Design a protein around this ligand. Structure first.
Ligand SMILES: CC(=O)NCCc1ccc(S(N)(=O)=O)cc1
Ligand SMILES: [Zn+2]
Length: 258
């Protein structure tokens, strides 16, 4: 690919190939609680995922994705700022070179160790992910900040699967899993209109950032960093990091459900 997280092909240089990187609806962003606006029209977040939709886990070079079957509404996200139903299609993480950084979104300047992203697409208005991905109201992603501390047992199935997709391109069956088990006990959230955090960087994402963080141990993060970005047979190249710096709000308003 023509982009990555290294010095020459990283976030700082993405604008060369993808001009939208300097757009007015880019993500992630720094959430300043003193500037958030509480909206009473915001309904509670509602997630209902069917574990049978879990499909496959793939090493995509810069990260790894856990995909779900999205042929029907067995796994959907509703409520919040949405009137339409969004269909689950994938969840993945972002992490940094060390525990002191790793999350993409930050709160009042505080950076966390990693971030969980659960993505969905608008199946009420569109017919496929490919179609919805470029629409302003096409995607919905739940972001959960991960604070380094106690080991998170609910990450077990995911971590145990990494040994089967160590190098770029490898993929394997990942079934019978409900990602709602990874979300925090409280679903209070912040929401704002944004974009995909990496190329193609489409400004088609309605972000749902959870107020409550979930835990993850130093060793579990080490597992993410032990994944290889190279293809099998080549010199090992660890996936040290894949988080984008926060971008200018550009007049956007971050709303709070609490
Ligand atoms: C084919 C496919 O699923 N590609 C990944 C698309 C994609 C999904 C979500 C995000 S994020 N970081 O904004 O949550 C970025 C890219
Ligand atoms: Zn992401």
């Amino acid at each position: 690919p023509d982009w990555g997280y290294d010095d020459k092909n990283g976030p700082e240089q993405w604008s060369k190939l993808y001009p939208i990187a300097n757009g007015n609806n880019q993500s992630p962003v720094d959430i300043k609680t003193s500037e958030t606006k509480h909206d009473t029209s915001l309904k509670p977040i509602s997630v209902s995922y069917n574990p049978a939709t879990a499909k496959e886990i793939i090493n995509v070079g810069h990260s790894f994705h856990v995909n779900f079957e999205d042929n029907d509404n067995r796994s959907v996200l509703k409520g919040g700022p949405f009137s339409d139903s969004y269909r689950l299609f994938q969840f993945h993480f972002h992490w940094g070179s060390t525990n002191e950084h790793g999350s993409e979104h930050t709160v009042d300047g505080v950076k966390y160790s990693a971030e969980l992203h659960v993505a969905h697409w608008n199946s009420a208005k569109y017919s496929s992910l490919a179609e919805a991905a470029s629409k302003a109201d096409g995607l919905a992603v739940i972001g959960v900040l991960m604070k380094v501390g106690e080991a998170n047992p609910k990450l077990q199935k995911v971590l145990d699967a990494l040994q089967a997709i160590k190098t770029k391109g490898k993929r394997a069956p990942f079934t019978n899993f409900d990602p709602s088990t990874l979300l925090p006990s409280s679903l209070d959230f912040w929401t704002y209109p944004g974009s995909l955090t990496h190329p193609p960087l489409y400004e088609s994402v309605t972000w749902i950032i959870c107020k409550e963080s979930i835990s993850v141990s130093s060793e579990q993060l080490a597992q993410f960093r032990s994944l290889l970005s190279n293809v099998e047979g080549d010199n090992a190249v660890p996936m040290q990091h894949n988080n984008r710096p926060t971008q200018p709000l550009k007049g956007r308003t971050v709303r709070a459900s609490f």
